[PDB]
Amino acid sequence: LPSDDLEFWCHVMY
C-alpha cells in the first residue's frame, strides 16, 4: 500500500 511502509509491512507479515 502507498500509505503503509515496507519496513512495517515486511515485519509483521513476513
Next chain:
Amino acid sequence: LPSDDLEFWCHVMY
C-alpha cells in the same frame, strides 16, 4: 495501475 506486489517486494530488497 502500478499494482505493488509484496511477494516480489519482500524478497529482492529485504
